[PDB]
Design a protein around this ligand. Sequence first.
Ligand SMILES: CCCCCCCCCCCCC/C=C/[C@H](O)[C@H](N)CO
Ligand SMILES: CCCCCCCCCCCCC/C=C/[C@H](O)[C@H](N)CO
Lengths: 58, 58, 245, 242, 242, 49, 297, 49, 99
Amino acid sequence: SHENSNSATEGSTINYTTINYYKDSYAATAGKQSLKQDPDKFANPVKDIFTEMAAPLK
Amino acid sequence: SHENSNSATEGSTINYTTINYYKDSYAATAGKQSLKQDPDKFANPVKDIFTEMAAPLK
Amino acid sequence: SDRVAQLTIGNSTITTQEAANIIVGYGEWPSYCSDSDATAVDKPTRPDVSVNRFYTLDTKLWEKSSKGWYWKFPDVLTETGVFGQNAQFHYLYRSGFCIHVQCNASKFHQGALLVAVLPEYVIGSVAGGTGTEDTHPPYKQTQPGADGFELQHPYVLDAGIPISQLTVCPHQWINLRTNNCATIIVPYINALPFDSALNHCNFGLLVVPISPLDYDQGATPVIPITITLAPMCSEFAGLRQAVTQ
Amino acid sequence: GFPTELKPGTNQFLTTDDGVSAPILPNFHPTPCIHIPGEVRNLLELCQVETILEVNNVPTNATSLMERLRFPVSAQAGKGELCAVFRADPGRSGPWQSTLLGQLCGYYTQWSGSLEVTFMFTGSFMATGKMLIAYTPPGGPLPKDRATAMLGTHVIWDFGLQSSVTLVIPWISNTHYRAHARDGVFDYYTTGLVSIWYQTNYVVPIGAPNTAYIIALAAAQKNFTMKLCKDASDILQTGTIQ
Amino acid sequence: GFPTELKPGTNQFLTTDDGVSAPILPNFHPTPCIHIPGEVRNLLELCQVETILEVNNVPTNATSLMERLRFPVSAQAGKGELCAVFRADPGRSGPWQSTLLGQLCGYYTQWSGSLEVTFMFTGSFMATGKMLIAYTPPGGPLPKDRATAMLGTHVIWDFGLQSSVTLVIPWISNTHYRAHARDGVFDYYTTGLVSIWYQTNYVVPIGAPNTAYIIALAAAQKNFTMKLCKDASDILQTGTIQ
Amino acid sequence: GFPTELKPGTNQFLTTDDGVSAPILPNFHPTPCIHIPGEVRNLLELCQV
Amino acid sequence: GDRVADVIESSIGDSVSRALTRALPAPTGQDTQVSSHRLDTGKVPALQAAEIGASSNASDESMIETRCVLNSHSTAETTLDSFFSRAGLVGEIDLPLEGTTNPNGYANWDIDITGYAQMRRKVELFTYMRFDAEFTFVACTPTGQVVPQLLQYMFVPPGAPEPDSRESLAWQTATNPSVFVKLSDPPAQVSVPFMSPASAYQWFYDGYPTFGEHKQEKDLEYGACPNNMMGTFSVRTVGTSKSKYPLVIRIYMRMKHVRAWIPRPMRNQNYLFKANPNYAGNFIKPTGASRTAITTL
Amino acid sequence: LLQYMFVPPGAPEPDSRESLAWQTATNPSVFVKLSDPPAQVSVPFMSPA
Amino acid sequence: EIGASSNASDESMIETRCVLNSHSTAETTLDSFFSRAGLVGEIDLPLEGTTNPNGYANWDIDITGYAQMRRKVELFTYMRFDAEFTFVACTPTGQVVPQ
Ligand SMILES: CCCCCCCCCCCCC/C=C/[C@H](O)[C@H](N)CO
Ligand SMILES: CCCCCCCCCCCCC/C=C/[C@H](O)[C@H](N)CO
């Protein structure tokens, strides 16, 4: 089970579970990702965040 | 897992990881080598080594 | 408060009284390149206050039948001041930006502007009308300079991509009823730690009027639009003689 | 030496099959990944971003394609007049095709969740008015007048220093998921209607324009989900791309 | 007895595939290995050895093939004259093809690292002089004169009891790796230029030769690396080798 | 690489055979099951009516 | 040595990226909480401001009276692998007996995935991608029958000598990877790594590769990214003489281990050229369907 | 050589043998030969209910 | 003149920054360079001819018959390795036949 660390997703925060039979790590299966989202990075990219209950402009 | 010790790289300093299904050890895979270099043996084959900062001929 | 703001950097200052907060591109501030990500070996230069300042490039007129304009970065600054000199003298480049758009009118004027930042905004051609001709945009269209360029088909943004989905990019609206300015802060966007400042353009800035300007006869008919911008955390490397283009 | 028996399903190529294949280049190591901003991990992140909705999809010529992005309001006779109507299906043909949410939902057969619509008023500062925005749950025909339309879910919008209002389309359905319906007998998964009625009037003083335009923006909520990935309906190629 | 299902990719022969094969000779034991000096474990060991660089690749006939290995210097008018120019691509056609580093890099598409060039002066003991050796980073045209050429990376060389100097070509690039460019639109991975200018003059007393030759040697540094092994461009066979 | 020998009975389709097959849709999750009354687990339940 | 206050207290050199947002796990859809009526002044979640550039954040619980729903709908199917790890057609190679396209029994196919609309629209939703690949080669005659023919596929990285004929010496493949396969066999399938000199493939590149005057002849350089030129794929029929059957080869690509950056609007016009976003100027059509009036369905 | 394709509701139905829908960028498909054993695939529970 | 490569580095000649180099050297090893298959011999079995008219042939094993392999293997003077041979057989038109 000693193989090269040469997949496209090495040096990433999330870890997969995959099956490999060769010494090169990019030959493995796609596997399962981890379910994490950051919707604010596109939906609410403001400097000073404001609460729902108030008026955005005051 | 009892096999003959008849590969081409027996009696060598470096060890490999390989996969074999037969009793002869030269039928296995190429595997992974170890990453060691001796560049001085070709680049700096002098008797008395000299520092970078000085003059080679004094 | 929130409607009033003052932006100061270097030896310049911008004040406003009808702000609408500040948008930070992709929720990230501009930053320098780290030692684990850099690939070139020479020491880069960081001129600091002489290049990180607000530059006012030009003024455009908003009319009832205007279609829109776009500007390319950092092509607008490749020939302005110390920043332009450094960009000409050096091979590599890395920086973010802070964009401020000025447009003011009265309480009896109406209209809306969409100000957006689209990275790698490649401009497509009309392909000769019928579409059997293999044309490419000319120099004045791909790299208009600091004078900008006018859109010909704003519904497709001259690339076959609908403007209704441009809001997925970092953006702000200029609605004359509410605000009179917009600010977007863009970090460095690229797949390389450093890139050329003359061959490569990182992003493009789009200003398209979605709601037409309208006012009653007698009010002021000349409504200008102004672009102001400041590089942030600039680096340069690979010093040689200057090259014009 | 090890006895085996081949089963049905050998020698076939399934396009969606997750498998292992022999690597062409041994010991190849890729270029390291630098930090690039704006990374996407799930399509639901992109489904929650407001994009312009084309309620006014009447015009078709190039010289007038741009006013499909907004619709007007003007002074009326104060009798609860009607402004516009549109359906609430994101993946169906109609107004929703101009949104990123609609384009992405065109790739999935089944969806579930509540939607949101935001309307931005771009009149002069001196113009006031009120409007009634109604959502009619599935099963009912189009309301004939404002009195009938109030009986659904609705919000009263007042023009002021805040230009926008949000109309939330709640998830009201008998099934957990909605398959994609279209013309014919499959409309049993209809979503409902949205209509905008005048509440009082569009009042403007002397010296300000008589007509103002409204821009609508659409998105999905945080309980929205899609399922059963498929190919999109429209193919953007007529001949050979070359 | 054990049920299996054959997958796509059976019965194919991949030349680079690492596999197991049946041994023809059972229980065969090879000749023991005695100690042989000069063992190689990595090509980067061979890439760090100085070999002669053919800056003067003008001559082509057999009677004059040997002066491609050096280029001359002589007394001038003291106006900062130009001596020679060459590019810095090791795996590209040109001067670098005569080096072991260049030949080995012809086997790999992508490289990364800094290079080094060493110049050896073979004039008489009584001859003095100074020279300016410049490296122009990518993007700029060839310098027109010494004043323009100094604005790049350069070293001032002084003739003395030490015959040689080292010019180090630093790794200045926008990408982590450089693919192999050639004539056409792929030159966006250009490396830069090296030009040698007179600094003062080539001064010689009475009784010593007026012309002296210079030999250049090239190698790579300790951060040099190659990638994506491929076949070499030139094939050394015209018919059947027999 | 692993030596194998095919046995009689390969490439046949037995209708009652209990086997494994490749899934067409990856990561597909079905609609949750609500409580429906009157569930059958064995035919002998129906045989006693 | 730093001695002046403006250098001691300087903020130059901060290489860490200040992140305003963080990623939170979300295996299922969000639950709905119980809500009741509210009759008060000063607190209004219905009114927003779309000028700021932020999506409106009014929820169900703030607008209508709602019940509690325990949402257990998974979000697993919308991930990048689930969306992209499906095979699709990207290229065809034709090997006719007589013709002008490939008359010699060999062909070279430059590897690019912008040749077919189904794959191109999916891949061009983003600007940068970094992934692994899986290629499959399905070969058959024009009538679709399978015949006993032996083929050779070769991967030619950029800089290697391209074959010029069926008897070229490049087919010795001493270093290039190659595949020998018969048409009677199952399709050939190989795995390919990430090969870019950069950290990602970019499908849009606003620039030129070289300096100089940008005249008419030197105009096609716009949008041409050298980092997406991944070489050539060469095919031939093994033999010294001409083959007996005309063959057609279709290539299918499946992505895996995917990462993507910078989403952009989807294409709404018909494609015309490869690596070229040009569109038919005189035949612009709307994104969606149209109707007679705005007040009717 | 045959091709099977699974078309979920809402996807474009092919209209001819040379239709563009056969690019199957998203639809699952099976390429198989008649000389091969029969094709066998596993399908989940797909109902909205 | 001494015969040693010059050992001046980047840090001694120009002003440089700190780069954390993480580029692997795994691909230039002897196995990575040489463990690739290539053509070394051809045997022809014609129906009529003067080369192999009887339906049998003898091929003396040597790998200096083809330039691609020969140039790679002759970079060195001594080698000690194991081998893997593969035999691809077809008719001149390239078809596969029951023989
Ligand atoms: C013997 C093996 C033969 C099979 C060769 C297949 C190798 C494929 C090369 C890598 C493909 C990379 C995927 C696409 C990269 C670029 O972005 C595209 N060219 C876009 O134009
Ligand atoms: C039934 C098995 C048939 C296959 C026979 C293959 C055996 C090959 C014999 C060993 C080859 C050794 C590799 C080359 C050794 C010598 O250096 C070369 N002849 C160089 O001329």
